[PDB]
Amino acid sequence: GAWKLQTVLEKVRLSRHEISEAAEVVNWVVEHLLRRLQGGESEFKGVALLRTGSYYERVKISAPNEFDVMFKLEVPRIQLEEYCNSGAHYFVKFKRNPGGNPLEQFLEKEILSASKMLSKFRKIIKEEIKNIEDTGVTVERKRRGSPAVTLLISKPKEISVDIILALESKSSWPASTQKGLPISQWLGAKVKNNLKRQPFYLVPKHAKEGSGFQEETWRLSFSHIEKDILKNHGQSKTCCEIDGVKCCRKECLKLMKYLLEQLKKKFGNRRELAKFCSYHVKTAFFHVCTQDPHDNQWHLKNLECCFDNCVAYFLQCLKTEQLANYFIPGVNLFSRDLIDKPSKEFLSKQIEYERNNGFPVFW
Numbered sequence: 243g244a245w246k247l248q249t250v251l252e253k254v255r256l257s258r259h260e261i262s263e264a265a266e267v268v269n270w271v272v273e274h275l276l277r278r279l280q281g282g283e284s285e286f287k288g289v290a291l292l293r294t295g296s297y298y299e300r301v302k303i304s305a306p307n308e309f310d311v312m313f314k315l316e317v318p319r320i321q322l323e324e325y326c327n328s329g330a331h332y333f334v335k336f337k338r339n340p341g342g343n344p345l346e347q348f349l350e351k352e353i354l355s356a357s358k359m360l361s362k363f364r365k366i367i368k369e370e371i372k373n374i375e376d377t378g379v380t381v382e383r384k385r386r387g388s389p390a391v392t393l394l395i396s397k398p399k400e401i402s403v404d405i406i407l408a409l410e411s412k413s414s415w416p417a418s419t420q421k422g423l424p425i426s427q428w429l430g431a432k433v434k435n436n437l438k439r440q441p442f443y444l445v446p447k448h449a450k451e452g453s454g455f456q457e458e459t460w461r462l463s464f465s466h467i468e469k470d471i472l473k474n475h476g477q478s479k480t481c482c483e484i485d486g487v488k489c490c491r492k493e494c495l496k497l498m499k500y501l502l503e504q505l506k507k508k509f510g511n512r513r514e515l516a517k518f519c520s521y522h523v524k525t526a527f528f529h530v531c532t533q534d535p536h537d538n539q540w541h542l543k544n545l546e547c548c549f550d551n552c553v554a555y556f557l558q559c560l561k562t563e564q565l566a567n568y569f570i571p572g573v574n575l576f577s578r579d580l581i582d583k584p585s586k587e588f589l590s591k592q593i594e595y596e597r598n599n600g601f602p603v604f605w
């Protein structure tokens with residue numbers, strides 16, 4: 243193959259060891275923290291580690307010094323109120339409970355308060371980290387527009403860990419997701435039904451930068467579903483297994499992430515590139531899996547054409563300024579409210595240039 247994509251995949255593979263070692267350090271610290279939370283008497287006594295995200299999907303290809311971790315908390319009887327038109331943001335309310343509400347301390351005027359819950363969450367984390375301060379682990383100061391409590395691990399490696407609190411609701415998916423997860427052709431109706439019977443999650447997200455009740459909103463998270471469709475990505479159950487056939491679906495996702503990350507290193511993460519992240523290419527990739535549902539379309543030998551399909555689709559989204567959230571179709575990740583036109587223009591041009599020259603940024 244002229245692009246020599248197998249050699250590129252070998253290069254990104256080199257990063258694997260560093261990422262696995264760092265992940266062990268992160269897991270040690272977070273397991274300590276979890277055991278403290280679970281042995282305590284706080285509302286967060288029921289938290290558990292939610293093993294999702296790029297690391298557990300095995301597509302974390304970079305940034306061994308940066309991890310995010312999700313703590314899930316089962317919350318019964320949730321009732322959502324949409325913040326606005328989109329389904330991007332919700333207020334969390336509760337349905338009547340004759341047995342009570344363990345989260346009463348966080349209620350403010352009908353609504354579960356995110357700032358109240360996070361303050362208490364941050365407080366508990368800070369006290370547990372202070373208790374083990376000889377370990378060299380500290381809590382980073384609050385960042386603007388970040389729902390996370392960031393841990394700074396200094397030894398034996400410098401690692402930033404974003405701890406994200408996620409509410410778990412074992413209830414029907416909200417109406418905004420009705421035409422979401424369009425995987426029927428790709429994975430089948432049975433798989434789609436099974437996945438939509440899983441719980442959904444809520445993580446704190448500000449609706450707009452203002453000061454006000456937009457500070458109290460939550461966004462949906464389906465990171466556990468994303469993990470499953472990445473891991474069990476074939477029409478056949480033996481796709482990419484030892485006794486099955488190798489497809490190149492994951493390799494393509496990795497190359498798309500790597501493309502964006504190498505462009506940022508090439509250009510110095512300038513203003514135009516700073517708003518694009520791996521979640522945009524992951525979303526584009528899922529839409530491509532839907533348009534090309536068959537395992538034989540992704541046979542390993544077909545790597546160049548498959549990767550080119552992903553790139554071409556991503557180019558089409560940049561030009562049309564349309565990239566629908568895979569679970570919430572009414573949410574456009576490429577709207578002008580989020581990313582201005584010249585930024586899309588600049589990335590389009592660079593991707594077009596890379597494509598026409600065999601992706602020299604990879605080398």
Ligand SMILES: O=c1ccn([C@@H]2O[C@H](COP(=O)(O)OP(=O)(O)OP(=O)(O)O)[C@@H](O)[C@H]2O)c(=O)[nH]1
Pocket residue numbers: 294295296297302310462463464465519520521524
């Ligand atoms: O539904 C989503 C999910 C994720 N995101 C955004 O994408 C970013 C990463 O989101 P994720 O943490 O959930 O995806 P990821 O593991 O696969 O990506 P990386 O960690 O490698 O970066 C987060 O900073 C979040 O703000 C959304 O905006 N919406």
Ligand SMILES: [Mg+2]
Pocket residue numbers: 295296310
């Ligand atoms: Mg992540």
Ligand SMILES: [Zn+2]
Pocket residue numbers: 475476481482487488489490491
């Ligand atoms: Zn496969």
